[PDB]
Ligand binder design. Structure first.
Ligand code: NAP
Length: 316
């Protein structure tokens, strides 16, 4: 099923995550995105950062060309990268995304992060200490340029990602605001459930979309390998046995029952098909309370590389 966004458009509540690290061959994104659509995913999440929009777009268009779906059945997301926050670069950046995917529009365009970076060749310009070279950009001006992309029909809906409550309030309080963010895509899982940010988002009819809902890919660039493995959690395992599902399915269903839209990345055929089974069962109030009890303020993304950024959303 879908949730109705605050601009009247509809978003499927289960989304497929397409990010894989650069060591994974680019051709895999094509294969697995087709498999996801074939399994029943209709919401597909990409970004300029992922260097896979050519492949993800081809997977979508291939499933259109092969008769499986129409463009109107797919909900396709991309994101403005942080080197393009200056308002004059927003539309060009979006047009690159459209060119790569060979699509006329995205269903959703997000500001990927509030942590603006120096414009240039690199995705991630850093100094000699490894910290990313920041840019100072009024994100309200960035947002105005996002609104023009919606008016031009290049993005059906616009929203944000990795914003905390205050950063979000800055947008909502902007003089002359035309379109509220339809969503805030943020790290969200039983060890970092974001319930306060969720309550705030609910109060403004903004959808919280969860990433790393399965514990993240635990990439050594950003994630401490000593951090607890979400999917090995004894409570999630006990609930999996109770319901004859898996820890992953429990973690996904938890988000759906909280009114959270949830992403799920898998590049494995069997797990991709497993993940759509989230619609086949329910958790009880007691199950949900047990999962709510797991919250431990654990953001997996935890690196020096962004912890010193002025717009770093977390308070550590
Ligand atoms: N806006 C942002 O800053 C941002 C940040 C992070 C992520 N995202 C988006 O959200 C997506 C998902 O988040 P994520 O990349 O952190 O990964 P994730 O959804 O939390 O998944 C983590 C891992 O779980 C495994 N997995 C999936 N299904 C499973 C199952 N049924 N049983 C056991 N393991 C399973 C996957 O490995 P296998 O591939 O081997 O199955 C995957 O590597 C990303 O792909 C991206 O689209 C956005």
């Amino acid at each position: 099923q879908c949730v109705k966004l605050n601009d009247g458009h509809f978003m499927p509540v289960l989304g497929f995550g397409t990010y894989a690290p650069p060591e994974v061959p680019r051709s895999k994104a094509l294969e697995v995105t087709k498999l996801a659509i074939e399994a029943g995913f209709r919401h597909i999440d990409s970004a300029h950062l992922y260097n896979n929009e050519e492949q993800v777009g081809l997977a979508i268009r291939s499933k259109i060309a092969d008769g499986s779906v129409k463009r109107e059945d797919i909900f396709y997301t991309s994101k403005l990268w942080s080197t393009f926050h200056r308002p004059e670069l927003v539309r060009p950046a979006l047009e690159n995304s459209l060119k790569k995917a060979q699509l006329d529009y995205v269903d959703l365009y997000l500001i990927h992060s509030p942590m603006s970076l120096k414009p240039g060749e690199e995705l991630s310009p850093t100094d000699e200490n490894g910290k990313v070279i920041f840019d100072i950009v009024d994100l309200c001006t960035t947002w105005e340029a996002m609104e023009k992309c919606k008016d031009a029909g290049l993005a059906k809906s616009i929203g944000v990602s990795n914003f905390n409550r205050r950063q979000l309030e800055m947008i909502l309080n902007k003089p002359g605001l035309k379109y509220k963010p339809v969503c805030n895509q943020v790290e969200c899982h039983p060890y970092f459930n974001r319930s306060k940010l969720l309550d705030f988002c609910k109060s403004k009819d903004i959808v919280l979309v969860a990433y790393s809902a399965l514990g993240s890919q635990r990439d050594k660039r950003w994630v401490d390998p000593n951090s607890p493995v979400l999917l090995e959690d004894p409570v999630l395992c006990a609930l999996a046995k109770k319901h004859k599902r898996t820890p992953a399915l429990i973690a996904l269903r938890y988000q759906l029952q909280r009114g959270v839209v949830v992403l799920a990345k898998s590049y494995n055929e069997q797990r991709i098909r497993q993940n759509v089974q989230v619609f086949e069962f329910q958790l009880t109030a007691e199950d949900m309370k047990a999962i709510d009890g797991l919250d431990r303020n654990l953001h997996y993304f935890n690196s020096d590389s962004f912890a010193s950024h002025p717009n770093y959303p977390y308070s550590d």
